[PDB]
Amino acid sequence: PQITLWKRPLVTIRIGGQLKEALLDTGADDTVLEEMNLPGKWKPKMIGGIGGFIKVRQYDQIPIEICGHKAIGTVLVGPTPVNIIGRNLLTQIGCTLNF
Amino acid sequence: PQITLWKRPLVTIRIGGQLKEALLDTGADDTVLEEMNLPGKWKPKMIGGIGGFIKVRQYDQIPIEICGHKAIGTVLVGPTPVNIIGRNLLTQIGCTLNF
Ligand SMILES: CC(C)CN(C[C@@H](O)[C@H](Cc1ccccc1)NC(=O)c1cccc(O)c1)S(=O)(=O)c1ccc(-c2ccno2)s1
């Protein structure tokens, strides 16, 4: 599909039994999801953007479905105001910028 | 061009006769540049990112050439971690997400 940018590029994602709306975000190196209690090992991390840093939990090899496309990779979980699909998963679903 | 996302989508912009590197950022509503001088009137604004809120200077109707494509619009200047081109100008240059 082609997504124009007149509005926020929000799409439906699935992570286990949770469907959420997430931003397709070319400015994000990694995927950052709102607080959720995912199973498995994780590592603490700090990520920075406008306003400073937040503390997140890094989970690896988490499967996520994005508009029916399969992805699997690192997901950072923490107190972000919006679910963010970053480049680590955008590449896996075939996402490019075009102009 | 078509830009893939295995690397950060950094491009050269021209603003006020200056060349800068900026990140094409579909998760940003606004275009936010690091501290710089721009002429004309501006007004104080606050914007929010992943880490909280910051104060910026809002300049309207500023020309920027983004990878050879002309835009004229609102540019915010303040303590962003990196120069970011947001949707307000991505739309002007006809940028879409595709997968
Ligand atoms: C700043 C950028 C370099 C990294 N961030 C991604 C941005 O697209 C961000 C997304 C956003 C939207 C709405 C609320 C909060 C955030 N947008 C914005 O900050 C934003 C949103 C709306 C208006 C505005 O003027 C700015 S980011 O959110 O700070 C970020 C995401 C992943 C990061 C990472 C670092 C290491 N591994 O992964 S850093």
Side-chain angles (χ1 to χ4, degrees), chain A residues 1-40 42 44-99, chain B residues 1-40 42-69 71-99:
Chain A
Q2 176 169 100
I3 300 176
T4 59
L5 296 168
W6 295 115
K7 66 178 176 75
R8 293 186 186 115
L10 294 168
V11 300
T12 307
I13 68 170
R14 186 170 70 76
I15 174 163
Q18 306 273 119
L19 280 60
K20 302 164 181 297
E21 296 294 298
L23 202 59
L24 297 181
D25 190 353
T26 60
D29 294 338
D30 289 300
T31 294
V32 193
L33 304 181
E34 295 164 7
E35 186 49 55
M36 58 181 315
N37 188 35
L38 299 176
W42 55 272
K45 191 185 175 66
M46 285 275 272
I47 61 174
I50 285 168
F53 283 76
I54 59 169
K55 191 167 203 297
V56 300
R57 307 193 305 281
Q58 178 177 337
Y59 294 83
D60 297 325
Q61 292 294 290
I62 299 302
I64 298 185
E65 265 226 359
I66 304 165
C67 306
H69 293 255
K70 294 181 177 65
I72 179 177
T74 297
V75 170
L76 306 180
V77 175
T80 177
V82 53
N83 292 302
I84 295 164
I85 302 301
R87 292 189 298 100
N88 74 306
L89 302 186
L90 293 174
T91 52
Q92 298 184 4
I93 69 176
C95 195
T96 58
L97 286 162
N98 304 78
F99 58 102
Chain B
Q2 173 163 273
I3 298 172
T4 60
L5 298 170
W6 284 284
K7 298 197 308 197
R8 290 170 174 169
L10 290 161
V11 302
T12 300
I13 67 169
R14 168 181 157 172
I15 180 175
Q18 316 306 125
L19 302 179
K20 296 175 175 278
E21 184 170 66
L23 182 70
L24 303 180
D25 188 350
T26 59
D29 301 340
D30 312 298
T31 294
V32 193
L33 303 185
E34 295 189 292
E35 180 51 37
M36 68 173 294
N37 292 310
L38 283 174
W42 55 272
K43 59 161 96 150
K45 182 187 178 76
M46 289 176 70
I47 60 174
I50 208 175
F53 281 73
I54 63 169
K55 291 167 66 182
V56 297
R57 304 198 306 281
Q58 177 180 331
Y59 295 84
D60 295 326
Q61 280 168 202
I62 301 295
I64 307 190
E65 184 183 300
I66 300 162
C67 199
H69 291 256
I72 308 177
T74 301
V75 175
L76 309 183
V77 177
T80 177
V82 192
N83 294 325
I84 62 179
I85 307 301
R87 295 188 295 98
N88 73 305
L89 304 185
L90 294 174
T91 57
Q92 293 199 15
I93 69 176
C95 191
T96 56
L97 286 164
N98 297 264
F99 58 101

